[PDB]
Amino acid sequence: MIAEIYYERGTIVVKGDAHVPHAKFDSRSGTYRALAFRYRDIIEYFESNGIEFVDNAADPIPTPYFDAEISLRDYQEKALERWLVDKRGCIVLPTGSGKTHVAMAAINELSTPTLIVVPTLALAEQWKERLGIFGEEYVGEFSGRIKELKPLTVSTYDSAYVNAEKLGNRFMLLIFDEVHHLPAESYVQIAQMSIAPFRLGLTATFEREDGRHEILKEVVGGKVFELFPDSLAGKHLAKYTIKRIFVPLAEDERVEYEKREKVYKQFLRARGITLRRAEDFNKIVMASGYDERAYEALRAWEEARRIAFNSKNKIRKLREILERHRKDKIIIFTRHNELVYRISKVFLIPAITHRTSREEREEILEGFRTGRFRAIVSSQVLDEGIDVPDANVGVIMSGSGSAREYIQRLGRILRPSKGKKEAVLYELISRGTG
């Protein structure tokens, strides 16, 4: 008898295992049962312990791969990345701080059926209008006025609570606008009765006059980021915004990419991080050793990675950005010469690679500073002093992950067009599974 889980009215019913975590025995129905929000852990348990199970619990509203373009100031990129560690926490920021942008970003980053829980219908109509950037045919509202079940669904705390069991297994990401309302002994059940592994709570005031904001940690999460008004006052960045674009691989790049990852997926030799127990730092630690020869499976990781960088949707997309920005000075950093040369010929743009030279730089950046040059493609931060041409558009070609290191680095070298005062950094990332 194999293991099996299924969703039953706000709980995860469990079969074939009397030792699963959080699962307690239903004397009334001879089954082990756990509130739905413990789904993630349960999954993560079967995984890490290489246990075989059938997942008849989750019933995700099918969702496309979003690719809207969301501009994010610097602090909002920090909050976002901070949240990306566990994809399960609360973000605290003053009003006007732009929490909604961080939310949009996660929704875009994650690309899973999502439910937004808001206090009022106005806020929901407002959130629904924002959400349209993803496509209005994917935005729905589930309330007392209408009950739609689309990938991006907006609902009020009151509506979502009354249909918590109905909504319980349809979503993977729960966003709570003004999460401080969630602790209500009722509303809190929206979260508990939900399998949604990813959760985000947005708010200006986390703590409650009743301490009840202590239950969030468990159901939603605790503050993973915070900032008081007196902190934004600094004449901070505001010289640029970030908009990462996710470009999917072409029908075929996508398939090869498969026969290149299921390899290191099982890790081969051990039960590594089955369900994100790393951050790319693990594929270098104990990994990277030489010992046996069953580590050569990892070489496929080293492979899949490039399958990314060298794509066609990223050049096609870059192309698009170039015409978009064809009256501004742009740089195009990238940690791949193999990709550095390609960009150079295709758009016929002067390069500046790891080989070049010493004199083979002085001019380019001068020609880039003299004019007739508002676009170049390098491979190293052009920061070594208090000069180097005013990039009006930054662009980073990455792979399957994000280089936050070059985001900043490359970001301050970008000076804002005197008439707009806000450069634009564009990190192009791919999909696949991340």
mmCIF file of all heavy atoms in Angstrom, residues 87-127:
data_model
loop_
_atom_site.group_PDB
_atom_site.id
_atom_site.type_symbol
_atom_site.label_atom_id
_atom_site.label_comp_id
_atom_site.label_asym_id
_atom_site.label_seq_id
_atom_site.Cartn_x
_atom_site.Cartn_y
_atom_site.Cartn_z
ATOM 1 N N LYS A 87 9.722 32.008 0.474
ATOM 2 C CA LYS A 87 8.462 32.284 -0.217
ATOM 3 C C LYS A 87 7.372 32.036 0.797
ATOM 4 O O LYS A 87 6.382 31.387 0.504
ATOM 5 C CB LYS A 87 8.242 31.342 -1.403
ATOM 6 C CG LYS A 87 9.413 31.197 -2.350
ATOM 7 C CD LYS A 87 9.043 30.422 -3.610
ATOM 8 C CE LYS A 87 10.274 29.843 -4.286
ATOM 9 N NZ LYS A 87 11.366 30.844 -4.490
ATOM 10 N N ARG A 88 7.558 32.557 1.994
ATOM 11 C CA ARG A 88 6.598 32.329 3.042
ATOM 12 C C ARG A 88 6.854 33.307 4.171
ATOM 13 O O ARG A 88 7.487 32.947 5.154
ATOM 14 C CB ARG A 88 6.764 30.892 3.544
ATOM 15 C CG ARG A 88 5.674 30.376 4.463
ATOM 16 C CD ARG A 88 4.899 29.248 3.786
ATOM 17 N NE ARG A 88 4.062 28.506 4.734
ATOM 18 C CZ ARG A 88 3.424 27.368 4.459
ATOM 19 N NH1 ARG A 88 3.516 26.823 3.255
ATOM 20 N NH2 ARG A 88 2.693 26.773 5.399
ATOM 21 N N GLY A 89 6.374 34.537 4.039
ATOM 22 C CA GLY A 89 6.592 35.508 5.095
ATOM 23 C C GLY A 89 5.831 36.798 4.915
ATOM 24 O O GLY A 89 5.045 36.927 3.996
ATOM 25 N N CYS A 90 6.065 37.755 5.804
ATOM 26 C CA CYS A 90 5.407 39.059 5.751
ATOM 27 C C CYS A 90 6.357 40.193 5.445
ATOM 28 O O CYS A 90 7.482 40.208 5.916
ATOM 29 C CB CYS A 90 4.718 39.359 7.064
ATOM 30 S SG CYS A 90 3.289 38.324 7.301
ATOM 31 N N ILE A 91 5.879 41.154 4.672
ATOM 32 C CA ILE A 91 6.675 42.296 4.280
ATOM 33 C C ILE A 91 6.108 43.571 4.895
ATOM 34 O O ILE A 91 4.964 43.930 4.622
ATOM 35 C CB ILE A 91 6.684 42.396 2.751
ATOM 36 C CG1 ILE A 91 8.044 41.988 2.224
ATOM 37 C CG2 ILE A 91 6.305 43.781 2.292
ATOM 38 C CD1 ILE A 91 8.199 40.511 2.046
ATOM 39 N N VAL A 92 6.885 44.261 5.729
ATOM 40 C CA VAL A 92 6.363 45.487 6.330
ATOM 41 C C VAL A 92 6.959 46.753 5.726
ATOM 42 O O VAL A 92 8.177 46.904 5.652
ATOM 43 C CB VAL A 92 6.563 45.507 7.850
ATOM 44 C CG1 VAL A 92 5.730 46.616 8.462
ATOM 45 C CG2 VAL A 92 6.133 44.180 8.441
ATOM 46 N N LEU A 93 6.074 47.655 5.294
ATOM 47 C CA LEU A 93 6.455 48.920 4.659
ATOM 48 C C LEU A 93 5.384 49.996 4.793
ATOM 49 O O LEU A 93 4.189 49.698 4.788
ATOM 50 C CB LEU A 93 6.701 48.715 3.170
ATOM 51 C CG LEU A 93 7.724 47.673 2.751
ATOM 52 C CD1 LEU A 93 7.633 47.477 1.251
ATOM 53 C CD2 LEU A 93 9.116 48.123 3.167
ATOM 54 N N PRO A 94 5.803 51.272 4.892
ATOM 55 C CA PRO A 94 4.834 52.363 5.021
ATOM 56 C C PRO A 94 3.951 52.395 3.781
ATOM 57 O O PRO A 94 4.275 51.789 2.772
ATOM 58 C CB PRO A 94 5.722 53.604 5.124
ATOM 59 C CG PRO A 94 6.988 53.083 5.740
ATOM 60 C CD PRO A 94 7.185 51.781 5.004
ATOM 61 N N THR A 95 2.824 53.087 3.869
ATOM 62 C CA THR A 95 1.926 53.215 2.737
ATOM 63 C C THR A 95 2.706 53.967 1.655
ATOM 64 O O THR A 95 3.616 54.736 1.966
ATOM 65 C CB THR A 95 0.694 54.007 3.149
ATOM 66 O OG1 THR A 95 0.108 53.385 4.298
ATOM 67 C CG2 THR A 95 -0.308 54.060 2.015
ATOM 68 N N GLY A 96 2.372 53.753 0.388
ATOM 69 C CA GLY A 96 3.113 54.430 -0.666
ATOM 70 C C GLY A 96 4.500 53.830 -0.921
ATOM 71 O O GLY A 96 5.177 54.211 -1.881
ATOM 72 N N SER A 97 4.931 52.901 -0.067
ATOM 73 C CA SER A 97 6.233 52.245 -0.217
ATOM 74 C C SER A 97 6.237 51.331 -1.425
ATOM 75 O O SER A 97 7.295 50.918 -1.882
ATOM 76 C CB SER A 97 6.575 51.380 0.996
ATOM 77 O OG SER A 97 6.513 52.108 2.203
ATOM 78 N N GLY A 98 5.049 50.978 -1.907
ATOM 79 C CA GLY A 98 4.935 50.117 -3.069
ATOM 80 C C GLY A 98 4.946 48.626 -2.802
ATOM 81 O O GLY A 98 5.557 47.866 -3.557
ATOM 82 N N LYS A 99 4.274 48.193 -1.742
ATOM 83 C CA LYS A 99 4.244 46.766 -1.441
ATOM 84 C C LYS A 99 3.646 46.024 -2.620
ATOM 85 O O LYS A 99 4.154 44.988 -3.041
ATOM 86 C CB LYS A 99 3.431 46.474 -0.174
ATOM 87 C CG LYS A 99 4.144 46.860 1.133
ATOM 88 C CD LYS A 99 3.349 46.419 2.370
ATOM 89 C CE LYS A 99 3.070 47.575 3.334
ATOM 90 N NZ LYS A 99 2.296 48.716 2.735
ATOM 91 N N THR A 100 2.579 46.576 -3.176
ATOM 92 C CA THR A 100 1.922 45.948 -4.302
ATOM 93 C C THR A 100 2.854 45.595 -5.461
ATOM 94 O O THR A 100 2.575 44.672 -6.229
ATOM 95 C CB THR A 100 0.825 46.831 -4.830
ATOM 96 O OG1 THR A 100 0.016 47.296 -3.738
ATOM 97 C CG2 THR A 100 -0.023 46.048 -5.794
ATOM 98 N N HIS A 101 3.956 46.328 -5.605
ATOM 99 C CA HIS A 101 4.899 46.055 -6.687
ATOM 100 C C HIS A 101 5.675 44.813 -6.347
ATOM 101 O O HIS A 101 5.990 44.005 -7.222
ATOM 102 C CB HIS A 101 5.858 47.222 -6.860
ATOM 103 C CG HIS A 101 5.205 48.448 -7.399
ATOM 104 N ND1 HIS A 101 5.132 48.715 -8.748
ATOM 105 C CD2 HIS A 101 4.530 49.444 -6.775
ATOM 106 C CE1 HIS A 101 4.437 49.825 -8.933
ATOM 107 N NE2 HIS A 101 4.060 50.287 -7.752
ATOM 108 N N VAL A 102 5.996 44.665 -5.070
ATOM 109 C CA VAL A 102 6.717 43.492 -4.654
ATOM 110 C C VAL A 102 5.775 42.307 -4.880
ATOM 111 O O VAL A 102 6.212 41.246 -5.344
ATOM 112 C CB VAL A 102 7.125 43.556 -3.155
ATOM 113 C CG1 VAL A 102 7.897 42.301 -2.777
ATOM 114 C CG2 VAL A 102 7.990 44.770 -2.891
ATOM 115 N N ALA A 103 4.484 42.484 -4.571
ATOM 116 C CA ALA A 103 3.504 41.405 -4.736
ATOM 117 C C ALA A 103 3.422 41.000 -6.195
ATOM 118 O O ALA A 103 3.503 39.830 -6.533
ATOM 119 C CB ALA A 103 2.165 41.849 -4.255
ATOM 120 N N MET A 104 3.255 41.985 -7.058
ATOM 121 C CA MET A 104 3.191 41.739 -8.483
ATOM 122 C C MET A 104 4.427 40.984 -8.916
ATOM 123 O O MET A 104 4.352 40.062 -9.732
ATOM 124 C CB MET A 104 3.174 43.048 -9.235
ATOM 125 C CG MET A 104 2.035 43.155 -10.194
ATOM 126 S SD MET A 104 0.570 43.125 -9.261
ATOM 127 C CE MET A 104 0.631 44.747 -8.639
ATOM 128 N N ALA A 105 5.578 41.387 -8.378
ATOM 129 C CA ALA A 105 6.846 40.746 -8.735
ATOM 130 C C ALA A 105 6.879 39.264 -8.365
ATOM 131 O O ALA A 105 7.334 38.445 -9.160
ATOM 132 C CB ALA A 105 8.032 41.496 -8.078
ATOM 133 N N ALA A 106 6.416 38.918 -7.166
ATOM 134 C CA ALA A 106 6.390 37.522 -6.741
ATOM 135 C C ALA A 106 5.440 36.753 -7.631
ATOM 136 O O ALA A 106 5.736 35.656 -8.070
ATOM 137 C CB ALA A 106 5.924 37.419 -5.309
ATOM 138 N N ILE A 107 4.288 37.347 -7.903
ATOM 139 C CA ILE A 107 3.295 36.698 -8.738
ATOM 140 C C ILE A 107 3.900 36.394 -10.088
ATOM 141 O O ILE A 107 3.706 35.326 -10.644
ATOM 142 C CB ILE A 107 2.060 37.581 -8.924
ATOM 143 C CG1 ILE A 107 1.476 37.946 -7.574
ATOM 144 C CG2 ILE A 107 1.006 36.831 -9.666
ATOM 145 C CD1 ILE A 107 0.204 38.731 -7.660
ATOM 146 N N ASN A 108 4.642 37.352 -10.608
ATOM 147 C CA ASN A 108 5.299 37.199 -11.894
ATOM 148 C C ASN A 108 6.442 36.183 -11.778
ATOM 149 O O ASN A 108 6.555 35.265 -12.586
ATOM 150 C CB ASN A 108 5.820 38.565 -12.355
ATOM 151 C CG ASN A 108 6.657 38.485 -13.608
ATOM 152 O OD1 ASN A 108 6.186 38.064 -14.670
ATOM 153 N ND2 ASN A 108 7.916 38.895 -13.493
ATOM 154 N N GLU A 109 7.286 36.351 -10.766
ATOM 155 C CA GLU A 109 8.396 35.444 -10.524
ATOM 156 C C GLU A 109 7.896 34.010 -10.398
ATOM 157 O O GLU A 109 8.315 33.135 -11.148
ATOM 158 C CB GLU A 109 9.093 35.823 -9.229
ATOM 159 C CG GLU A 109 10.416 35.124 -9.017
ATOM 160 C CD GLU A 109 11.595 35.968 -9.488
ATOM 161 O OE1 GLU A 109 11.700 37.154 -9.068
ATOM 162 O OE2 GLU A 109 12.419 35.435 -10.272
ATOM 163 N N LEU A 110 7.000 33.780 -9.438
ATOM 164 C CA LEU A 110 6.427 32.454 -9.181
ATOM 165 C C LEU A 110 5.513 31.864 -10.261
ATOM 166 O O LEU A 110 5.558 30.660 -10.498
ATOM 167 C CB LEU A 110 5.692 32.442 -7.837
ATOM 168 C CG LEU A 110 6.593 32.316 -6.607
ATOM 169 C CD1 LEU A 110 5.755 32.188 -5.365
ATOM 170 C CD2 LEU A 110 7.471 31.085 -6.743
ATOM 171 N N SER A 111 4.670 32.686 -10.885
ATOM 172 C CA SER A 111 3.795 32.227 -11.965
ATOM 173 C C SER A 111 2.872 31.040 -11.616
ATOM 174 O O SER A 111 2.683 30.128 -12.436
ATOM 175 C CB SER A 111 4.667 31.852 -13.163
ATOM 176 O OG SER A 111 4.049 32.140 -14.404
ATOM 177 N N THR A 112 2.315 31.038 -10.407
ATOM 178 C CA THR A 112 1.419 29.968 -9.967
ATOM 179 C C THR A 112 0.036 30.555 -9.708
ATOM 180 O O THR A 112 -0.098 31.766 -9.516
ATOM 181 C CB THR A 112 1.874 29.329 -8.631
ATOM 182 O OG1 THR A 112 2.168 30.359 -7.682
ATOM 183 C CG2 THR A 112 3.076 28.496 -8.810
ATOM 184 N N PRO A 113 -1.012 29.697 -9.688
ATOM 185 C CA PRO A 113 -2.374 30.188 -9.435
ATOM 186 C C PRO A 113 -2.258 30.949 -8.147
ATOM 187 O O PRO A 113 -1.662 30.443 -7.213
ATOM 188 C CB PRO A 113 -3.195 28.906 -9.305
ATOM 189 C CG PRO A 113 -2.179 27.837 -8.997
ATOM 190 C CD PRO A 113 -1.001 28.225 -9.820
ATOM 191 N N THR A 114 -2.809 32.154 -8.078
ATOM 192 C CA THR A 114 -2.636 32.941 -6.880
ATOM 193 C C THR A 114 -3.948 33.469 -6.383
ATOM 194 O O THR A 114 -4.847 33.717 -7.182
ATOM 195 C CB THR A 114 -1.698 34.144 -7.174
ATOM 196 O OG1 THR A 114 -0.510 33.682 -7.845
ATOM 197 C CG2 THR A 114 -1.333 34.890 -5.868
ATOM 198 N N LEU A 115 -4.049 33.644 -5.062
ATOM 199 C CA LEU A 115 -5.246 34.201 -4.441
ATOM 200 C C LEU A 115 -4.795 35.401 -3.619
ATOM 201 O O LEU A 115 -3.842 35.311 -2.854
ATOM 202 C CB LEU A 115 -5.912 33.192 -3.504
ATOM 203 C CG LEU A 115 -7.437 33.185 -3.242
ATOM 204 C CD1 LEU A 115 -7.634 33.047 -1.769
ATOM 205 C CD2 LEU A 115 -8.152 34.412 -3.738
ATOM 206 N N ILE A 116 -5.466 36.530 -3.801
ATOM 207 C CA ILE A 116 -5.153 37.721 -3.049
ATOM 208 C C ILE A 116 -6.349 37.909 -2.140
ATOM 209 O O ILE A 116 -7.491 37.823 -2.580
ATOM 210 C CB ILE A 116 -5.001 38.980 -3.946
ATOM 211 C CG1 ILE A 116 -3.858 38.799 -4.954
ATOM 212 C CG2 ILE A 116 -4.704 40.200 -3.076
ATOM 213 C CD1 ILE A 116 -4.295 38.248 -6.307
ATOM 214 N N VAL A 117 -6.084 38.140 -0.863
ATOM 215 C CA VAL A 117 -7.133 38.342 0.101
ATOM 216 C C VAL A 117 -7.003 39.780 0.588
ATOM 217 O O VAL A 117 -5.991 40.169 1.149
ATOM 218 C CB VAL A 117 -6.984 37.335 1.222
ATOM 219 C CG1 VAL A 117 -8.122 37.456 2.193
ATOM 220 C CG2 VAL A 117 -6.950 35.968 0.633
ATOM 221 N N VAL A 118 -8.043 40.567 0.339
ATOM 222 C CA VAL A 118 -8.081 41.980 0.697
ATOM 223 C C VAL A 118 -9.271 42.298 1.616
ATOM 224 O O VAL A 118 -10.251 41.562 1.643
ATOM 225 C CB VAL A 118 -8.174 42.836 -0.579
ATOM 226 C CG1 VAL A 118 -7.056 42.463 -1.503
ATOM 227 C CG2 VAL A 118 -9.502 42.610 -1.279
ATOM 228 N N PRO A 119 -9.188 43.393 2.399
ATOM 229 C CA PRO A 119 -10.291 43.751 3.305
ATOM 230 C C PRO A 119 -11.598 44.179 2.623
ATOM 231 O O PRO A 119 -12.682 43.742 3.013
ATOM 232 C CB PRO A 119 -9.701 44.886 4.144
ATOM 233 C CG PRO A 119 -8.237 44.583 4.163
ATOM 234 C CD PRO A 119 -7.968 44.155 2.738
ATOM 235 N N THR A 120 -11.496 45.011 1.591
ATOM 236 C CA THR A 120 -12.675 45.537 0.915
ATOM 237 C C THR A 120 -12.848 45.153 -0.578
ATOM 238 O O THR A 120 -11.965 44.533 -1.178
ATOM 239 C CB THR A 120 -12.666 47.080 1.061
ATOM 240 O OG1 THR A 120 -11.788 47.640 0.088
ATOM 241 C CG2 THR A 120 -12.129 47.485 2.432
ATOM 242 N N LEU A 121 -13.992 45.504 -1.175
ATOM 243 C CA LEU A 121 -14.221 45.205 -2.594
ATOM 244 C C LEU A 121 -13.514 46.247 -3.454
ATOM 245 O O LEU A 121 -13.084 45.942 -4.572
ATOM 246 C CB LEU A 121 -15.724 45.151 -2.940
ATOM 247 C CG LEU A 121 -16.526 43.868 -2.601
ATOM 248 C CD1 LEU A 121 -17.978 44.069 -2.924
ATOM 249 C CD2 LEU A 121 -16.020 42.670 -3.367
ATOM 250 N N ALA A 122 -13.381 47.469 -2.931
ATOM 251 C CA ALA A 122 -12.675 48.551 -3.648
ATOM 252 C C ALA A 122 -11.208 48.188 -3.850
ATOM 253 O O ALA A 122 -10.644 48.365 -4.934
ATOM 254 C CB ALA A 122 -12.751 49.842 -2.874
ATOM 255 N N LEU A 123 -10.599 47.696 -2.780
ATOM 256 C CA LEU A 123 -9.210 47.288 -2.797
ATOM 257 C C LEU A 123 -9.082 46.158 -3.785
ATOM 258 O O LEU A 123 -8.086 46.045 -4.474
ATOM 259 C CB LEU A 123 -8.775 46.800 -1.406
ATOM 260 C CG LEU A 123 -7.798 47.628 -0.572
ATOM 261 C CD1 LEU A 123 -7.315 46.804 0.610
ATOM 262 C CD2 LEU A 123 -6.591 48.019 -1.426
ATOM 263 N N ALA A 124 -10.103 45.323 -3.857
ATOM 264 C CA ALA A 124 -10.059 44.189 -4.745
ATOM 265 C C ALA A 124 -10.197 44.611 -6.190
ATOM 266 O O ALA A 124 -9.552 44.017 -7.065
ATOM 267 C CB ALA A 124 -11.143 43.204 -4.374
ATOM 268 N N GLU A 125 -11.041 45.615 -6.456
ATOM 269 C CA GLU A 125 -11.218 46.109 -7.833
ATOM 270 C C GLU A 125 -9.905 46.766 -8.254
ATOM 271 O O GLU A 125 -9.490 46.685 -9.412
ATOM 272 C CB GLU A 125 -12.333 47.146 -7.916
ATOM 273 C CG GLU A 125 -13.675 46.684 -7.410
ATOM 274 C CD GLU A 125 -14.743 47.777 -7.516
ATOM 275 O OE1 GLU A 125 -14.541 48.900 -6.986
ATOM 276 O OE2 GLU A 125 -15.798 47.512 -8.133
ATOM 277 N N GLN A 126 -9.272 47.423 -7.284
ATOM 278 C CA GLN A 126 -7.982 48.093 -7.446
ATOM 279 C C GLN A 126 -6.889 47.040 -7.758
ATOM 280 O O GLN A 126 -6.159 47.154 -8.740
ATOM 281 C CB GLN A 126 -7.669 48.828 -6.150
ATOM 282 C CG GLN A 126 -6.672 49.932 -6.261
ATOM 283 C CD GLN A 126 -6.452 50.605 -4.928
ATOM 284 O OE1 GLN A 126 -6.119 49.945 -3.937
ATOM 285 N NE2 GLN A 126 -6.630 51.925 -4.890
ATOM 286 N N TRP A 127 -6.774 46.022 -6.912
ATOM 287 C CA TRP A 127 -5.823 44.944 -7.150
ATOM 288 C C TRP A 127 -6.111 44.289 -8.493
ATOM 289 O O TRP A 127 -5.181 43.946 -9.212
ATOM 290 C CB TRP A 127 -5.925 43.860 -6.085
ATOM 291 C CG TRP A 127 -4.948 43.997 -4.998
ATOM 292 C CD1 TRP A 127 -5.149 44.607 -3.816
ATOM 293 C CD2 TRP A 127 -3.606 43.475 -4.967
ATOM 294 N NE1 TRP A 127 -4.019 44.501 -3.025
ATOM 295 C CE2 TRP A 127 -3.057 43.811 -3.709
ATOM 296 C CE3 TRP A 127 -2.815 42.756 -5.878
ATOM 297 C CZ2 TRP A 127 -1.749 43.456 -3.331
ATOM 298 C CZ3 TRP A 127 -1.499 42.396 -5.500
ATOM 299 C CH2 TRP A 127 -0.991 42.752 -4.236
#
